[PDB]
Amino acid sequence: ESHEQCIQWIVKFIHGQHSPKRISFLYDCLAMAVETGLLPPRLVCESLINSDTLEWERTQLWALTFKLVRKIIGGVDYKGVRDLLKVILEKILTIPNTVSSAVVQQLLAAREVIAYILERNACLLPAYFAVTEIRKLYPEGKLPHWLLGNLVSDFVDTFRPTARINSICGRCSLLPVVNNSWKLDPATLRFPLKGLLPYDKDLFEPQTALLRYVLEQPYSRDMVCNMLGLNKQHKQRCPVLEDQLVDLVVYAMERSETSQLLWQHLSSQLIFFVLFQFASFPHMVLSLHQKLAGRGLIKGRDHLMWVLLQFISGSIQKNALADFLPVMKLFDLLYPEKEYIPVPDINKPQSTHAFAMTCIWIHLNRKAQNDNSKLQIPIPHSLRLHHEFLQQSLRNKSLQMNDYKIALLCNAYSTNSECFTLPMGALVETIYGNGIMRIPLPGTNCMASGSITPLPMNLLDSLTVHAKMSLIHSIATRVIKLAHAKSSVALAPALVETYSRLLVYMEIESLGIKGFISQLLPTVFKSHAWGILHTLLEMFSYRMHHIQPHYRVQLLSHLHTLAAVAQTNQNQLHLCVESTALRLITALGSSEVQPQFTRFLSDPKTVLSAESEELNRALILTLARATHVTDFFTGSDSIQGTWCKDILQTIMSFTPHNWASHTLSCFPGPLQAFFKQNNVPQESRFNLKKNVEEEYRKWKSMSNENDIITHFSMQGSPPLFLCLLWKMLLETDHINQIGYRVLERIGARALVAHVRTFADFLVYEFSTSAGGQQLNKCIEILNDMVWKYNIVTLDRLILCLAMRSHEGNEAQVCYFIIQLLLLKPNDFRNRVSDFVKENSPEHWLQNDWHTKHMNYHKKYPEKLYFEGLAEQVDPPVQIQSPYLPIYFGNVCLRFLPVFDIVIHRFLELLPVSKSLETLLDHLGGLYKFHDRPVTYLYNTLHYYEMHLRDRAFLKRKLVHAIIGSLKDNRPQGWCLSDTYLKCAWVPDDTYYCRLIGRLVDTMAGKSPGPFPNCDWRFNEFPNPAAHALHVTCVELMALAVSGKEVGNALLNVVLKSQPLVPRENITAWMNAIGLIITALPEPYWIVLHDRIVSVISSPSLTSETEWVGYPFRLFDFTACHQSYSEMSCSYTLALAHAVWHHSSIGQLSLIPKFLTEVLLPIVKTEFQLLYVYHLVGPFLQRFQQERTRCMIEIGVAFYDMLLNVDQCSTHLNYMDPICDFLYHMKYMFTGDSVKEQVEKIICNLKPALKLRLRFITH
């Protein structure tokens, strides 16, 4: 209380005293009082500086006050000195630029006190606090105050080495592959930097190149939203995003001047941002008009008008007319001259593009007619032909489908109701088949509409977004009406194909794919149709390419509840649900399992199944593969604490099972530990044999009609009726009518358990049976039971065989059964040979698919209701169950996921490697119809690198069989390089240079292109970059060269003086190398540690040289003419930063162990210590967000290294940068966590270092 008042009174009396001598005397008395301890120095300093009467005008009074504070400022804690520095700088800032020359000499007192505070020898406060306040109150780009002078600039200049330590080399030139490192500030397009340090000038500018690259790539909508922080909560109205899209449009027109895919991508992309209120259409148009004005070069005018028409047609009703007026100004600038524009040729798709402006005028005029008067939009004088041609075409009653006139009418008259029913009717009646006769469908007693010709893809691309929404709404309404009507007539194949082709457009996501799962499927489910549901599920399985993971998981849950309830005890529906679920589980990505399963820990049973053990095992296999590829468990040896525990426990509580040793040995460690416990006892082979024999004897002794049916179909009895069947066919080779009746009453959902037990019974019987004639007889019986009698399907039988838990010889005979069943009979081989010969996988370019489908099904009919057994029973029984519509699938397409699983099991078991070669040779052509062959090859080689390490012939055979089976359907050079086709041998440096260069040119973007262009809407990869990365990885994996050699060669591409890799572009090569080596398995990217150790032991860092200044040249690769040693030292650091930038958190978890056990015992000099700080510095932020524990190890390792270097070295020349880095780390990342172990290390340091870091403990 009275301390502040008394000091203020004394100082104010001093202010009012006109005697400077008395002023000095009273200051001296106050100084003596502070010296003797009468008053707290912090309170005295605060009161003196915060005194209001103290003004710059009284120059002698100001100087004496600042002299007093300078004398007595040294007795304050560091936090106080920081606060007094804050208030002093605030007070100094009030000084104007120009002052009198007679008071300058007396105003230096502020400079004297600020210099004393900033002095490092005094160590009053940590220098990080001082630079933080200076940087906070002086932002980047502000000149220092003239009174302060160059002292502040030099002090800030002291911290650049720390800024370079905490910076990633070549960050602005690193680009990702679109599928927290790439986050940007929404307001300024700037990287989020930690702390207030003088970073490089390149980090203070927007990342326009990065944002443009992400925007240009297809399917980058979600990534852009994540990068810019758009939460989809309200109208963000992001100005930088709007400007980038406008510049992208300008650049597209620039390319158009002296491109169709880019224009389609723009029209497809910038619709979403405008529709979600992220950008404004009128503001976009005005900005585009202003930018394009005065430049000319007008050749992409038709494409730009096509882009604008999408909004003009799709949002005219829900927006005011005032927002679309500037389009007229855009026309005035973009279309010169007054001559009548000629009518283009209507036979080309570009005719729709050339009529875009006319359609815009029609929409605008119609919107003007609504709410008439006020304003009227007249016709331009140069659109008379375009208007008359449209009206004359409208007046025509008959319209043909050989031209694009109907597309022109739909695009122009999509708003007026009266002039739109006729073109819509003419467009939908060609696929609805309302008047034509009826066609047969595969199966028995199934008919559909006569339409077989769907709408062509190029015609669909010629329509507009609004027309496509109207078409898809009409199709959906007709489907719902048919579902409610309960009619036995199936939908037209043309309607189904057109719907599937329309569901690949992302602009209709509001009701295209969202309404397909949210509304249409539940409506058909409640309507109890079972015919449309089968059609939609088959459409999902065989005609869908790109679907978001959450939609896929949602349909997985819908499939599981559909199979669980609603009494879906039909063979066709049950098989369709099982096949769709198996494909959906298998096709899951590696980086999508955790984010899509983390939201279902509330009710895991929604996604997990209740009775399908095969589906549960498939989910477990996918989970193990994803966790292995993503390196999730690297660092943690316990499964508890992760999301997998709840899912695995729920699986074990639903379908308990065991795992084979060879299959379990490839699982990650936590999964192996989980399955070591939770082991379920299994049935004995003697017990199973005795039970089957006793039941079979009971079957002989029983003669009553009802007793057999009521006994062998009981629920809860052991599922061993298939074993009864098998035993009757090897004892008597005939089945009675009672057996057919039992099979009919068991049910599809109950026969699965019988198949499961039959597989184990089947394996045990071959194992204990004489080979030769008995083996040939017993495989002939199985062939008859599969094809001749139609008891079980081949795909389900092989899947159940491959999902068993046998060991050793039992596993060998189990896989030998699959071998014999697949190859020894001629049935499957003939079916696959025919299908591959006369079919093609490109379904989006075909028009006779139904005819080819009918031809195959007529040649090879499919039975799903025990038709063969029904006919072969001695009294011929007749079955008249209607067949659900079948449009796309067959046995060959259904077997594909089972064949992938079979390959994996054959790879797991060692003594059966020769069988896989024979399997691939005979049935390798079936991969022509695979959906993700390259991704499957990448996953298979990545997962089984250890097992395929010593077997290169099998690896090459697998790669060639999968890849070369599609060589007649894609352009040359799509996957493998020319050198590989001529050599496959030790690859040389040129091979790796060209391999990396292919990805570099693909990412850069070139007109010829290393890889051929493809329609990514119907491809497994969204962008060329992902395709290039995966094919490069697959080729490198298939190389018969050790992983260490491959990694060394890839590093040597940059780190050795080599042609074909020019300077001024080395960062792009480093980025490509980092991406490739990160995607490669562990033995490939482990050579980085060895290379770092080699540079650490280099004489460049080991030498006790007398360099003046900070050694900047060793850590920056963009330097002047460099010697070999310095060039290698800087290039290794840059390459390490590039690799670690693209690495996952599991891959980064090995750095603390590497520092602790490798670098620590060999770091003994200041240069090695600085090199380690440069290497591991910039990546502490990543550990802060995911793995907190690794921070503690890194911090103690750094202090241990500092202790070792201090003890070994006589003196240190760069104490200040080390001090600043440790202070920065403590105040930003680690904090107070490390205290006890820090004190022990600090106490043993030299007195100079102890004085420098006396504030770490506090």
Residue numbers in the entry: 54 to 232, 239 to 317, 327 to 1052, 1061 to 1334
From the paper:
One function of Mediator complex subunit MED23 is to mediate transcriptional activation by the phosphorylated transcription factor Elk-1, in response to the Ras-MAPK signaling pathway. The MED23 subunit is the largest subunit of the Tail module and is specific to metazoans. The structure is composed of α-helices that engage in HEAT-repeat motifs, forming five solenoid regions which are designated as HR1 to HR5. The overall shape of MED23 is that of an arch with a concave and a convex face.
To validate the approach, we first determined the structure of MED23 alone by cryo-EM. We obtained a high-resolution structure of MED23, in which most of the structure is defined between 2.6-3 Å resolution, except for the N-terminal region, which appears more dynamic. The structure is comparable to the previously reported crystal structure, with the main differences lying in the first N-terminal HEAT-repeat (residues 1–50), which appears dynamic. MED23 core is composed of HR2 to HR5 regions and adopts a triangular shape in which HR2 to HR5 coil to position the C-terminal HR5 region in close proximity to HR1, which protrudes out of MED23 core. We also observed that the 501-516 segment located at the HR2-HR3 junction is disordered in MED23Elk-1, whereas it is structured in MED23, where it folds into two short strands at the molecular surface. In MED23, this segment contacts HR4-lid and the HR2 region, in particular helix H19, and is therefore ideally positioned to detect allosteric changes resulting from Elk-1 binding. The closed HR4-lid region is not predicted to be a protein-protein interaction site in free MED23, whereas the region of MED23 exposed upon HR4-lid alteration has all the characteristics of a protein-protein interaction site. Overall the core of MED23 and MED23Elk-1 superimpose well for all HR regions (with mean rms deviations on Cα < ~ 0.6), except for the HR2 region, which appears slightly displaced upon binding of Elk-1.
